[PDB]
């Protein structure tokens, strides 16, 4: 693909719940969590759902969020992000979702991937709705 590649794979996690398809959504989990956390985590998911009132009729990418990289010898071996967007749905409300994504862990590359959502309506980040765990 022709954009970076933590927005390549961030528009196919925002297009998993456009979609409500949690199988999608979850098959971006850390390898840990889908071998450890898989009720749990597709439960929790169901709500993030359910919080969403209407299908989305539009969004666009905020940036990566904020994170860390670590380099050693010239060969990143970790890099953190949280990728970003805000969302509309057809009721008129604004929501903005940020994914907690570990994109390279070379110690621990079942920790690699999605461990946590975050959620909220109009920016309102002091009422939101928080899924996954902490790695």
């Not at 022709?2 to 961030?10: L, V």
């Not at 969590?33 to 929790?44: F, G, I, Q, T, V």
């Not at 905020?62 to 010898?73: I, L, S």
């Not at 994109?103 to 991937?113: A, D, F, L, Q, S």
Request: proline share 1%; charged share 30%.
């Amino acid at each position: 693909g022709d954009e970076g590649n933590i927005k390549e794979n961030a528009v196919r996690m925002m297009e998993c719940i456009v979609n409500k398809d949690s199988e999608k959504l979850f098959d971006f989990y850390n390898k840990d969590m889908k071998d450890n956390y898989k009720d749990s985590s597709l439960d929790e998911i169901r709500q993030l759902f359910e919080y969403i009132d209407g299908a989305i009729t539009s969004y666009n990418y905020e940036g990566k969020g904020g994170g860390q990289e670590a380099k050693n010898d010239g060969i990143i071996c970790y890099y953190s992000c949280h990728p970003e967007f805000d969302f509309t749905t057809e009721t008129g409300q604004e929501y903005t979702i940020s994914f907690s994504y570990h994109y390279i862990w070379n110690e621990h590359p079942e920790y690699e991937g999605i461990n946590m959502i975050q959620i909220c309506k109009d920016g309102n980040w002091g009422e939101k709705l928080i899924i996954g765990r902490n790695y």
